[model samples]
Target: SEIDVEIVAVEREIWSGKATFVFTRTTSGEIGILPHHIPLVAQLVDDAAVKIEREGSDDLWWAIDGGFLSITDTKVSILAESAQARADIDEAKAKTDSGSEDPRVAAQGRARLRALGQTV
Candidate 1:
């Protein structure tokens, strides 16, 4: 199985190679996309994780914020509003940004950082 995911923000391109599965968190909830998923259109939340799984490999992650996810029969596209590679992330900023009155947003930031392999 193959999946095409486009992180629009930060223009991070990943999983163009191949993926057995892909999972993303949306405004609604977590959605898993397998090969040839049905057509779908949904709003993505800010500060989310896109996990990619290839055959015989562990999951790879991307930190993203604000985007839309669209899935067709053969392709899954995530047009992110903001996206960044974990290796390029700035932990200090993430910690500072998590200090918000809105707890959900703050928590999302935390989860995003952890998902990207950063410690709390």
Candidate 2:
């Protein structure tokens, strides 16, 4: 397989590797990705897991939100709305902040504010 994919967040790199299969949950539906899959564009749900399969190992998982994915020339790039490498997720913090008021949500808003130089 020659599929290449890079998963990125606004300020972080989530995952980058060759993949034989990929799967994600989106606003519209769950998606399955295979090498040489056709091109597509869609908005994604926040707080979903992105699963990737490499050649010979357990699949990798990343928690994602609000991003886009593009595949062309056998390359896959996932730009996450917000993501934490599944391994890096702060479980205690996440459990403490499950609702809309989660700091992650505020952080995103803050990121936007900073991008536009807005202070609250």
Candidate 3:
């Protein structure tokens, strides 16, 4: 069995699926979650891309800014303020947006770029 997963943004749900593992940087530290993990919640890191691994499927990548990771029973929920797929990133906009004073804004731009294998 896989972990019941949901990546929810403020305005809408970004993605939902079963995953074998979930990896991301959190306020406490970088961590990975597997199926049947304990129940808890943690804040996400400012500059990081979320990685979700599934069986017999390509890994999923997300550039997320400001969020909480919640796990209960066998379900994992990522409640993000904003979430974008690596494929959807705009290089020029990312570079310009990364100049903002807000760490979350600046970090997310670069995070998205990095997720796409682009140099910052």
Candidate 4:
């Protein structure tokens, strides 16, 4: 079974597709969602990576600043303060921008870099 996943940043929609699973970090910890999962709503951690797994396709990765994740039996919604696709990230800029004084903000850059498989 597959679930519909939609991810949106404050500015725009980041991705929407059918996926078998989703992985992400919440304020509490990391969580994974599979089709027919129970209903849930969780606070997303700042500077975390969101991963979506689909059949016959490479996994999708998104760097999110902060947001909320809502899951129903067949749908998942992510509303984020800011979000960017891993493929579009600029690793050089991300590395230099990781110095936000606020730990949360700093984590945002670090998370993006991490999502890109770059050392933070």
Write model 1 residue lDDT over 3-115, tens digit each, in one string.
76655554555435558888877788888888876889987666667787878887677766676788888877777645656666567656765766576567556646856
* Whole-model alpha-carbon lDDT for candidate 1: 0.69
Q: Taking the tens digit of each residue's C-alpha lDDT, what string does model 4 give over 20-49? A: 778988888888888877989999877778
What would the C-alpha RMSD of candidate 2 be, to one decimal place? Answer: 8.5
* Top lDDT prediction, candidate number: 4
Candidate 1 vs candidate 4: which has greater TM-score? Answer: 4
- Cα deviation of 109 in candidate 3 (Å)? 0.8
Each prediction's Cα RMSD? 3.7, 8.5, 2.1, 1.9
Off by over 4 Å in 3: 118-120
- Summarize candidate 3's per-residue lDDT along 1-120 as a digit string, tens digits: 788779899989989989988887777878888887788888887666788888989888788777788888888988888888877888876777677778767888877776676543
| Candidate 4 regions with alpha-carbon error over 4 angstroms | 102-105, 118-120
**Each candidate's lDDT (Cα)?**
0.69, 0.64, 0.80, 0.82
TM-scores for the candidates: 0.74, 0.74, 0.86, 0.89
**Tens digit of lDDT per residue, candidate 2, span 15-83?**
688877887666777788888767777665555556788788877766666677676767778887666
**How does candidate 2 fare on TM-score?**
0.74
Ranking by lDDT: 4, 3, 1, 2
Residue 120, candidate 1: C-alpha displacement in angstroms: 12
Q: Kindly state the number of residue pairs that clash in model 1.
A: 2
- In terms of lDDT, the poorest run of 10 residues in model 4 is 96-105
